[PDB]
Design a protein around this ligand. Sequence first.
Ligand code: BGC
Ligand code: BGC
Ligand code: BGC
Ligand code: BGC
Ligand code: BGC
Ligand code: BGC
Ligand code: BGC
Ligand code: BGC
Ligand code: NA
Ligand code: NA
Lengths: 340, 340
Amino acid sequence: IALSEIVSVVNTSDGRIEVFGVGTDNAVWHNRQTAPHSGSSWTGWISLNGKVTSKPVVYINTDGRLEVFARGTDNALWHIWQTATNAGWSNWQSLGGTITSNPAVYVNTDGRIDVFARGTDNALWHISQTAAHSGPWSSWQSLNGVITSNPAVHINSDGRLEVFARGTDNALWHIWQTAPDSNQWSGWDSLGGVITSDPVVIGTADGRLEVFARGSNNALYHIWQTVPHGGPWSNWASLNGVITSAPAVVKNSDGRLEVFARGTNNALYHIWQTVSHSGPWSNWATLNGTITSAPTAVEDADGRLEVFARGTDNALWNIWQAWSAWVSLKGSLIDASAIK
Amino acid sequence: IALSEIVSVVNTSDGRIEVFGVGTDNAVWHNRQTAPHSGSSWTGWISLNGKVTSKPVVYINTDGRLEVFARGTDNALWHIWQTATNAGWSNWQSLGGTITSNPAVYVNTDGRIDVFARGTDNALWHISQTAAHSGPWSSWQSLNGVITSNPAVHINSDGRLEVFARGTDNALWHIWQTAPDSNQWSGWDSLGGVITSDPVVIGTADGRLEVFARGSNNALYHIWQTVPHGGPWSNWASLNGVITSAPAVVKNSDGRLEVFARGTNNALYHIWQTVSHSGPWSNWATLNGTITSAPTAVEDADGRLEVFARGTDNALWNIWQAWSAWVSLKGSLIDASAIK
Ligand SMILES: OC[C@H]1O[C@@H](O)[C@H](O)[C@@H](O)[C@@H]1O
Ligand SMILES: OC[C@H]1O[C@@H](O)[C@H](O)[C@@H](O)[C@@H]1O
Ligand SMILES: OC[C@H]1O[C@@H](O)[C@H](O)[C@@H](O)[C@@H]1O
Ligand SMILES: OC[C@H]1O[C@@H](O)[C@H](O)[C@@H](O)[C@@H]1O
Ligand SMILES: OC[C@H]1O[C@@H](O)[C@H](O)[C@@H](O)[C@@H]1O
Ligand SMILES: OC[C@H]1O[C@@H](O)[C@H](O)[C@@H](O)[C@@H]1O
Ligand SMILES: OC[C@H]1O[C@@H](O)[C@H](O)[C@@H](O)[C@@H]1O
Ligand SMILES: OC[C@H]1O[C@@H](O)[C@H](O)[C@@H](O)[C@@H]1O
Ligand code: NA
Ligand code: NA
């Protein structure tokens, strides 16, 4: 499994990027832009406390309240939430279970958050809010299978959640809701290939799921739905390169997909659709730097991509689509990924 | 009340703009882009039938299914929906009531559509889906007040719906949910001024509501929340000009607000935030043409603004942010607005 993303990042409901990482104390720390603009100053790192043994994953509830999910020292799923949109936080609360992966998080069309995690049986399990952005939470329920990666989740353009994970054959497997808001899940399907990273999944500007992963030759690969929210899937296509981290994918403000990955020389590299969305891909270009994590990419409130990655000093470094000079957000981050 | 928008327009879940208008037969007709790109060809006009006595208002359910709301010849609220995302349509069904305005439509954080309409008592009434993108619908419920315009609705950045309408004093009044998904609504509040158009409301890139309306001197005015999802509101500010239609507002792909209105010479005019979102406004610029409706503006799948307006030939004409040459979508549209 290629070197993981070190932070979870979201553009908040007031247009400020907030990042969540694990400190040397194994607590979750957050940093937020002071202003909703490219090159904004930052609040600085503020602790949510806790003791996590996974990558923390933030998600924005449909009412704008941020909610962080992370495995605890007891291997239970824990969570903590803003009590008001972009305001104070709750205490950490357990959702129980015994999980063996980072959580994957998305929200159903009914505003109910769905959290996916590998179990001690190596099956995909999930637990959900029973009301929109509200407790109580459901029971833990199994979707079966045997997965050898952290899971990834994205909603289809018809509101059906779809989960991607590596199988015991190192192929990309996936499973989907057969209707929105449903616990009627499909059987597992193999999209084949051999992946040596966690999969990442995004929705194209024309409403198709597209999955990126590193292959056995350390090139970037991708595969996509050929119709909106539907099969068949394309064959695997190489985007080439030699990458030494997990890839991070993001949509430009004009819908062009752009992928960030660490190269052999430990610099940040990127490759993008040219002209328009679902257009022909560029060749790889360097953004330089020296990074000790996978990059994490998000669009800011000015419609510019922002990239975060840990540096050799273990601080979180930022670069944005002007491109800008590398700047440090400081702090000291660790890779707490449940699967490495 | 300044000349109204003639179509309801949405960017569908597969990145194709679809427009809804009233034909000379008083049926609702729709036209959709063949491709999810600027300057795409169109399907041509296809009838949903019905007999409407209001502007038709389309909304995308959280599962991607389009749903159109319009007053019938019996003055009841009627609706029709796609049975699958971007697929076939249902028959028209009545939601009953007796309404005296165009419908205003938004979705709650729980995926429940909320429809607002003036009653025969000139009070603001509403009816909602009781489950996410699903029937049965609620009873009609009154929010009281006396309104002299079509209502406008937008969600706050904390998930609270907020409705704007002109009062008997010709001032801008508003009312809001005190919590998301709630029928706990606030009292009416006056934002003062004198408006001679329907209000239009948008959410800024930094999570604030901003309202645009024509004033007594036929200038464009605007007023905004000074904090995300919160008061106090600004004082009214003039964006000047002399406009002879309702203004239409839209966010650029980079969050810059842009406003479209008909000028004294019947040409399309526009004015925009410069540099970045919540930045200083341009002066008015012409896009020429000769229009016989207010313009309607939406962002396409390429991140470019598209504007629609009826021409002197009663066809719907299109121009986009390249700017492009005016092109005709043909058809023959009427202004069916319930309040003129
Ligand atoms: O108050 C809202 C919060 O309530 C908690 O009980 C739930 O577990 C959270 O998921 C929710 O966001
Ligand atoms: O029914 C829809 C489903 O069809 C399957 O064949 C595809 O592999 C899934 O990605 C899709 O969600
Ligand atoms: O076409 C725009 C593209 O051009 C490149 O020069 C930039 O570095 C990319 O981030 C961008 O997506
Ligand atoms: O629809 C086909 C296109 O989908 C895009 O999102 C992919 O990145 C392209 O490689 C592909 O040609
Ligand atoms: O099937 C979905 C549709 O069902 C109808 O009964 C409801 O009235 C619509 O609002 C809904 O979109
Ligand atoms: O409580 C929030 C509400 O506060 C009021 O003072 C504002 O006028 C409303 O726009 C806002 O939604
Ligand atoms: O800064 C970009 C702006 O420049 C003007 O020339 C265009 O006509 C506007 O549509 C655009 O928003
Ligand atoms: O926050 C203040 C700013 O809000 C913007 O959305 C308005 O268009 C500006 O006129 C105003 O200066
Ligand atoms: Na994340
Ligand atoms: Na509309």
